[PDB]
Enzyme design. Structure first.
Site, PDB file in Angstrom:
ATOM      1  N   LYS A   1      31.238  27.641  52.857  1.00 17.00           N
ATOM      2  CA  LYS A   1      32.086  26.659  53.533  1.00 17.00           C
ATOM      3  C   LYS A   1      31.277  25.676  54.371  1.00 17.00           C
ATOM      4  CE  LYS A   1      35.964  26.218  56.783  1.00 17.00           C
ATOM      5  NZ  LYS A   1      37.289  26.770  57.178  1.00 17.00           N
TER       6      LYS A   1
ATOM      7  N   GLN B   1      37.041  37.857  54.585  1.00 16.04           N
ATOM      8  CA  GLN B   1      37.270  37.448  53.203  1.00 16.04           C
ATOM      9  C   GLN B   1      35.953  37.155  52.486  1.00 16.04           C
ATOM     10  OE1 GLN B   1      40.339  34.223  53.390  1.00 16.04           O
ATOM     11  NE2 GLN B   1      41.722  35.922  52.900  1.00 16.04           N
TER      12      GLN B   1
ATOM     13  N   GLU C   1      45.497  33.418  40.960  1.00 15.01           N
ATOM     14  CA  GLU C   1      44.219  32.899  40.478  1.00 15.01           C
ATOM     15  C   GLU C   1      43.892  33.398  39.078  1.00 15.01           C
ATOM     16  OE1 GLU C   1      44.583  34.326  43.436  1.00 15.01           O
ATOM     17  OE2 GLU C   1      43.846  32.981  44.998  1.00 15.01           O
TER      18      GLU C   1
ATOM     19  N   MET D   1      51.668  48.262  20.936  1.00 16.27           N
ATOM     20  CA  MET D   1      50.457  48.673  20.231  1.00 16.27           C
ATOM     21  C   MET D   1      50.046  50.091  20.610  1.00 16.27           C
ATOM     22  SD  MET D   1      47.946  47.276  18.122  1.00 16.27           S
ATOM     23  CE  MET D   1      48.619  48.604  17.125  1.00 16.27           C
TER      24      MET D   1
END
Ligand SMILES: Cc1cc2nc3c(=O)[nH]c(=O)nc-3n(C[C@H](O)[C@H](O)[C@H](O)COP(=O)(O)OP(=O)(O)OC[C@H]3O[C@@H](n4cnc5c(N)ncnc54)[C@H](O)[C@@H]3O)c2cc1C
Ligand SMILES: Cc1cc2nc3c(=O)[nH]c(=O)nc-3n(C[C@H](O)[C@H](O)[C@H](O)COP(=O)(O)OP(=O)(O)OC[C@H]3O[C@@H](n4cnc5c(N)ncnc54)[C@H](O)[C@@H]3O)c2cc1C
Ligand SMILES: Cc1ncc(C[n+]2c([C@@](C)(O)OO)sc(CCOP(=O)(O)OP(=O)(O)O)c2C)c(N)n1
Ligand SMILES: Cc1ncc(C[n+]2c([C@@](C)(O)OO)sc(CCOP(=O)(O)OP(=O)(O)O)c2C)c(N)n1
Ligand SMILES: Cc1ncc(C[n+]2c([C@@](C)(O)OO)sc(CCOP(=O)(O)OP(=O)(O)O)c2C)c(N)n1
Ligand SMILES: COc1cc(C)nc(NC(=O)NS(=O)(=O)c2ccccc2OCCF)n1
Ligand SMILES: COc1cc(C)nc(NC(=O)NS(=O)(=O)c2ccccc2OCCF)n1
Ligand SMILES: [Mg+2]
Ligand SMILES: [Mg+2]
Ligand SMILES: [Mg+2]
Ligand SMILES: [Mg+2]
Ligand SMILES: [Mg+2]
Ligand SMILES: [Mg+2]
Ligand SMILES: [Mg+2]
Lengths: 582, 582, 287
Positions: free
Chosen positions: B171, B122, B59, B485
């Site tokens: 949901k 979740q 994601e 860096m």
């Protein structure tokens, strides 16, 4: 005593004070990924001769590795990230540790104090972002506070209900010189005064009495019992009560034991859910009555007297209202109840063999079952072969999905902290980094990541970590080319209408995509693929016998379904016991 | 008019209302990764014939791709994730979009409304987590609100100062049936009433007057000018004022142009920082005076009259106090000032050729320079060859580090939205997913990810996305085997003491680790490695001429340093112009 | 209306809070700093470059002084009724404009702002941003403790004064010479004025007296002062006002003067909320 690398009158940087604070906590391993705002901390780490750093390739890998370290050892996991994008990459791990009660101390570098609030370079308000997904967090505003805050962070992460604590350290504090004071008292008066006391004999004897008055008792064991396997096992000797375990509690009581009902809940065994459904006494030890387990709350253990022993008073009565409750350490409650049971043994005459026989009839009529189609490899079979070839002594970590459930169902965990799995949040990509942390914490153990192809690729970059750190991590990849668990729900509830669950290449539909063997090859990790069930046993044996890391790509038919299944919010009468995607 | 797939009196699921809300916004592409809490949305997506979904492998890849889509097109990027671990994986992208003012609409599935607050399966409070790293966010509590909230989210993401907006959708709302009302008025009275008005001629003529009274004017152009290249170019014709650009503004004014001072700031050119240091009029158009640019604020443009034109009133006077200010769209301010300059041209007699000549002396004494050691490939040279072989017309995305600065310095961007780079947050792993989004938004363009080996591996899993979606993404990987860096700062300020910046395998120290070619091989992407400067030109040419995706592994000596360098918080007199790690 | 405010002016804004500069009105020039220092610096420039600048705005000043003569602050006198505006003007004279003034919130607050000539800052103590009734009496307590030798007067309304009337006990016990000039119109005056202008004089709980005895001053604020041992008096006729205020000032220690006023007075002028200069109201009341 502790030996510092600095004189008691010698000023040193705050970064050096922070590292010594970790040393004084017994920290030996950290998972730290450097950036500008944490360079001072990393320089101070190289000056430490007792702390090893495992450099991940992604900070989400760092925090998940710290979780695996913690879950497999009982010690707190320590991860370190830089400001801004480093800190935000920890976020999934912090939430995961909070939902599963994993002890964890996360240290983030921060921009200089005077820059805070000005949209500075690589600045995010990580203390604000993580307040609701950590047990506690800190913004250090003075170098003199480093000893006290580190001590409080470890105390909070590991006491009571364990959880993650984040400590945000501005770069100017890391560079400031000071003489630390290691004698500062912690400032947790409210928390420390509300710590549960050892359970009273008053409450413990009422429970033993309730056991003798019951005919159908069921133990309901979860993550809170991970430090109580001896006390719990002794408790089961004295009472003969069958044990149903949650996903988080697997291995607290041995799975191969005859009194074991295995896992309960949405994908629990028919007989475990049967026991809870028809019990008259439910001993809920170290559990939080989550919706994956209970289903419809009104129907869960609807005719049982419920004893709930939890160390977190906020959990007692949160979803299911108990009859009896003990707020305290289940380890102590078991020790106290075991003494009562030993003395008053002959006065109690405990025998539940009639209830046990009723459950063993359910255990024979409805065991866990899988089908074998030709020479295709059943994933259930692959895990069973891994159990045998490792003698059930391997530390197992998983991703999230069908392979997770199968790794829960078909591996007989003998001790707690063999099972490392994301239960509450259910975060894909957990398995590989978690195995990294578990191997560092248990160098002599067999460590196997039973992963799915979607979960495994999410943090595939940690293969470089496994090689560079020369960790003997085994990867048992159950490759069904799909987001399997979501595919299963498409089959059941959406007429098998695929909505972006296929992970292969549609241009070459019958080709295994991607080629996970070349991912292992890129990182110098030996690998192999097995497709025919006849080849599986030797393939797994090769993975185990080959020293060092190894990836085994196990191809599996995607139409498999995890069974049984109580649909979300359903009751025991709604359990699904047959069907797949064929 | 718009044609719905449903009758105006036909009830449909909230998920179908949400997808049609996207269709009514002109959305054609989304980056959506399915999970339990968003399955309904994904089912509704398959019913849409006008919206394509690009399935990422992580994601964070989804949100970064949505960023690349947005930054390369001017349209909002749309990513979609499930609840819990899906939502938390967006967090770095949300913070990155907020710090860089990128328009973005993120949709997360959420547990059912009645489950919120109960530590459900979740569940994370994503609205609480992201409140401080989004421009605005929503928790939808009724299906009737979906049209209005989606409309407000796109309006907020794209108007004023652009930014990310997150919409959290439980949901049960996705499954509820309703008849949408697409005529609902938005509820943004305060925001809409505080929107900047078109600039007054009063303010605009004062600026044109200040230009005529000045001898050393410098344009200071940033990300706010990305939609004003024509107006800005016309403005430079009429005034002959030299243009210094920020990292975010690159390409607003063409880099190959003679009036271009290139980039200013910490790694800006000596002559750009010289101009700002000695200017008497600083035209700060679409900039936010960040610390990478200004250094010590008191010394930045210390003898200049500062004109600041910003669309965000909160930025005007935040760090540097201007003399004159215009709160509004710089596009309109340029249009208004261009009319004044055209009419009053002969009355103004603008000529800064004496100042320009003073700067061109600095441009000749201190140009951007690099060294060539034997046959080793200079990274600076590799980017210059890419510029030539693509004629400066490629869309460029980068990771973060030395390669990012070199891609900024040695590529001549001719138009804005060729340059896609994480500036404010500076998030590694941005380059590959950003290239994915840019290619989907610009199918006919040359898209090149100039990536570092640390940055590239962080989201290497998106190689599978590139193959499956058959995107012609080129990867120019500048491989120095280090976190370059951070290594450079170790050399300058920590006596070259390495603290976990080496990314190779210490057991085989002189071997390129890992083998990025096999990462490309695993995903069926042709790849090659080049080591000798003599082979570089043909290698890059091969990458460009080979249709479809391609990875070129460019090995580079790690001792290179990005120059010049004004140390953090320093002044122009502190600029470093020589040295490396040798 | 912000768009109409100083719509043809170059706006210089000097504020010590950077968050205020450009918050509502966008300035042309801005200085973020202490206005005291900005004035000191600008005064030096003006002194030196005086003859080079030749500053003369007498033509603009004359244009404004024409407006100052055509539209001064005005009030009406009805018979022997006491105009509240007049009462404050008499207080100004009898104190020579040197009194510290605190107020409640409402019509009496505006009149205390309009008709008292404050000569120095920190003579004027009034709740402006929040506009909290009940501020005047306690504020006078604090001002008197901080300025023991000053004349301190609480110009209060009857609604505002009763909200914290209990502090009269504080004034007595601490022996503070707090004077209370109570402009008593028996109403929540400012809300009453808006009822008259915008709601057809429909009273919605703005009357503070006793409807059973409608023509009686209720409550009797003199007995509130009496309960706390504070001398008090009531004045109703404009002829008696000057001596009444003089008595309040000359009587040592605390003192309450109940000044009865016709309730139909309106604070003028009035630019309606969100209006422009062309919307200013300059006439009318509740009669
Ligand atoms: C795809 C998927 C499917 C799942 N399906 C199932 C399933 O079918 N069955 C299942 O069981 N799970 C399932 N889960 C896992 C699940 O969502 C929860 O993680 C789990 O059910 C809850 O574990 P628990 O009840 O033991 O409480 P935990 O999360 O383990 O927390 C421990 C509890 O004990 C308490 N505690 C901690 N220490 C002590 C102590 N010393 N003394 C006393 N108390 C203590 C804590 O306060 C807390 O209440 C699934 C997960 C996934 C990802
Ligand atoms: C390793 C690294 C090194 C870096 N070093 C440098 C460096 O040497 N030099 C450098 O320049 N950057 C450097 N940066 C990038 C940096 O930190 C900032 O991202 C950048 O300097 C700020 O860009 P900006 O000033 O254009 O403001 P932006 O972040 O681009 O925001 C745009 C500004 O304009 C305004 N705006 C937006 N739209 C409009 C409009 N229509 N009209 C008017 N105003 C508008 C916004 O309110 C905002 O104030 C570096 C980044 C990294 C990761
Ligand atoms: C970061 C993240 N993103 C998306 C998720 C939503 N889920 C799942 C779920 C149950 O949590 O949905 O609620 S499981 C799943 C698919 C698992 O693919 P696999 O690894 O191949 O394993 P398998 O053996 O094939 O099933 C997804 C996409 C998730 N949990 N984490
Ligand atoms: C998610 C994330 N984690 C750590 C970061 C801290 N930083 C950097 C910095 C400047 O932001 O530090 O402030 S740059 C950098 C190293 C870049 O490795 P490379 O990709 O190989 O590129 P190169 O050409 O070799 O330099 C790190 C580790 C970061 N920004 N993002
Ligand atoms: C704590 C408190 N409560 C109510 C208030 C609402 N207001 C007012 C206002 C303008 O703020 O309304 O916006 S003014 C007002 C009435 C004042 O009654 P008075 O004291 O008798 O004085 P007067 O000379 O007669 O007008 C009220 C009720 C207020 N500000 N504070
Ligand atoms: C390319 O710029 C780089 C690169 C590297 C490797 N390191 C740093 N370090 C600092 O800039 N340190 S700082 O002066 O205290 C500072 C000042 C202002 C804002 C932030 C901040 O710190 C941010 C952490 F990087 N900068
Ligand atoms: C393995 O369990 C799975 C697997 C999959 C693929 N999907 C779901 N879906 C639900 O459980 N939907 S739910 O009834 O509305 C629900 C009830 C309670 C808490 C959360 C919640 O939703 C969470 C999103 F998953 N569950
Ligand atoms: Mg078999
Ligand atoms: Mg799968
Ligand atoms: Mg001027
Ligand atoms: Mg050359
Ligand atoms: Mg590198
Ligand atoms: Mg008169
Ligand atoms: Mg009144």
């Amino acid at each position: 005593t502790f030996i510092s690398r600095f004189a008691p009158d010698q000023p040193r940087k705050g970064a050096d004070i922070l590292v010594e604070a970790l040393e004084r906590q017994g920290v030996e391993t950290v998972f730290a990924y450097p950036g500008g705002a944490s360079m001072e901390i990393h320089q101070a780490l190289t000056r430490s001769s007792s702390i090893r750093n495992v450099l991940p390739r992604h900070e989400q890998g760092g925090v998940f590795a710290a979780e695996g370290y913690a879950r497999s050892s009982g010690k707190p996991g320590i991860c370190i990230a830089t400001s801004g994008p480093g800190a935000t990459n920890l976020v999934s791990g912090l939430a995961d540790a909070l939902l599963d009660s994993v002890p964890l101390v996360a240290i983030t570098g921060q921009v200089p104090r005077r820059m805070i609030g000005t949209d500075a370079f690589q600045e995010t308000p990580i203390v604000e972002v993580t307040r609701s997904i950590t047990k506690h967090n800190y913004l250090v505003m003075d170098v003199e506070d480093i000893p006290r805050i580190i001590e409080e962070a470890f105390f909070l992460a590991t006491s009571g209900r364990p959880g993650p604590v984040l400590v945000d350290v501005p770069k100017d504090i890391q560079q400031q010189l000071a003489i630390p004071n290691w004698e500062q008292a912690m400032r947790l008066p409210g928390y420390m005064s509300r710590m549960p006391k050892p359970p009273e004999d008053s409450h413990l004897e009422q429970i033993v009495r309730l056991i003798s008055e019951s005919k159908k008792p069921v133990l309901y064991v979860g993550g809170g019992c991970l430090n109580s396997s001896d006390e719990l096992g002794r408790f089961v000797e004295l009472t003969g009560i069958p044990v149903a375990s949650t996903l988080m509690g697997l291995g607290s009581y041995p799975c191969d034991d005859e009194l074991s009902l295995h896992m309960l809940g949405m994908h629990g065994t028919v007989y475990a859910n049967y026991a809870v459904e028809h019990s008259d006494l439910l001993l809920a030890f170290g559990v939080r009555f989550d919706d994956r387990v209970t289903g419809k709350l009104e129907a869960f253990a609807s005719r049982a007297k419920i004893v709930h022993i939890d160390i977190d008073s906020a959990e007692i009565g949160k979803n299911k209202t108990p009859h009896v409750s003990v707020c305290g350490d289940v380890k102590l409650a078991l020790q106290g109840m075991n003494k009562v049971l030993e003395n008053r043994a002959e006065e109690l005459k405990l025998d539940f063999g009639v209830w046990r026989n009723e459950l063993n009839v359910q255990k024979q009529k409805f065991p866990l079952s899988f089908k074998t189609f030709g020479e295709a490899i059943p994933p259930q079979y692959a895990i069973k072969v891994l159990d045998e070839l490792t003698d059930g002594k391997a530390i197992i970590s998983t991703g999230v999905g069908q392979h997770q459930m199968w790794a829960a169902q078909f591996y007989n965990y003998k001790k707690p902290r063999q099972w490392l799995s994301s239960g509450g949040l259910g975060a894909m990509g957990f398995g590989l980094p978690a195995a990294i942390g578990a191997s560092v914490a248990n160098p002599d153990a067999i460590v196997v990541d039973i992963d799915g192809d979607g979960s495994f690729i999410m943090n595939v970059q940690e293969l470089a970590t496994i090689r560079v750190e020369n960790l003997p991590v085994k990867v048992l990849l159950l490759n069904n080319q799909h987001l399997g668990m979501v595919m299963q729900w498409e089959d059941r509830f959406y007429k098998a209408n695929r909505a972006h669950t296929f992970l292969g290449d549609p241009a070459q539909e019958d080709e295994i995509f991607p080629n996970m063997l070349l991912f292992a090859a890129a990182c110098g990790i030996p690998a192999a693929r097995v497709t025919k069930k006849a080849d599986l046993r030797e393939a797994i044996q090769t993975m185990l016998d080959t020293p060092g890391p190894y990836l085994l790509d196990v191809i599996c038919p995607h139409q498999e379904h995890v069974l049984p299944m109580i649909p979300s919010g359903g009751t025991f009468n709604d359990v699904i016991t047959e069907g797949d995607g064929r």
